[PDB]
Amino acid sequence: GAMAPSYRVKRMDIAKNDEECVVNAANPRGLPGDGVCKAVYKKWPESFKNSATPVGTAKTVMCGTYPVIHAVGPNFSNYTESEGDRELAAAYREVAKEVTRLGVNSVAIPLLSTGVYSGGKDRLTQSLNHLFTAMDSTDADVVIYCRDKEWEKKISEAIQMRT
Ligand SMILES: CC(=O)N1C[C@@H](C)Oc2c(F)cccc21
Ligand SMILES: [Cl-]
Numbered sequence: 001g002a003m004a005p006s007y008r009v010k011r012m013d014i015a016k017n018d019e020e021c022v023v024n025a026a027n028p029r030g031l032p033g034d035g036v037c038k039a040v041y042k043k044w045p046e047s048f049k050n051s052a053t054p055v056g057t058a059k060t061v062m063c064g065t066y067p068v069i070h071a072v073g074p075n076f077s078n079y080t081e082s083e084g085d086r087e088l089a090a091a092y093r094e095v096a097k098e099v100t101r102l103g104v105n106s107v108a109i110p111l112l113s114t115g116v117y118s119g120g121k122d123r124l125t126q127s128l129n130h131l132f133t134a135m136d137s138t139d140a141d142v143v144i145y146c147r148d149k150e151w152e153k154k155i156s157e158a159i160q161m162r163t
């Protein structure tokens with residue numbers, strides 16, 4: 001475990017993370033994809049061997065000894081708000097199981113279903129609250145990665161509100 005488990009947020013490419021493992025915002029078919037998924041494919045392509053997994057699940061594949069946890073959030077274009085909310089919560093619970101199983105002291109994580117799977121809606125708060133619900137019982141240092149300057153401020157505010 002971390003000596004004083006924390007949450008942090010950084011605005012940069014998650015392919016440049018300084019953590020012991022990464023969470024990919026994966027598609028269900030293990031394809032290179034776009035956004036975070038394409039960055040992850042360029043950095044850790046070996047981790048896409050048999051990485052296909054259903055919506056609401058996570059599947060870990062090692063790139064050398066570096067664990068890539070492929071977490072499949074729902075595409076809100078296809079799911080109802082109700083069913084998508086349930087699957088997005090479930091993907092983060094499976095991430096927390098994997099982080100625990102791996103025994104890592106730190107994990108880099110993007111906000112699932114906030115980009116091309118958002119169905120064109122702002123889901124920062126919805127996705128971050130499901131992240132906290134899953135990760136709060138883990139003792140890994142969590143570092144959240146984002147690309148937008150205003151999202152950085154809002155994620156940082158939400159972290160500091162609870163401390
Ligand atoms: C830049 C912004 O506000 N974002 C985050 C970005 C990754 O994607 C989005 C989206 F698909 C739908 C609504 C908002 C956003
Ligand atoms: Cl960067």
Ligand SMILES: [Cl-]
Nearest residue numbers: 114115116117
């Ligand atoms: Cl997405």
Ligand SMILES: [Cl-]
Nearest residue numbers: 146147148151
């Ligand atoms: Cl972002």
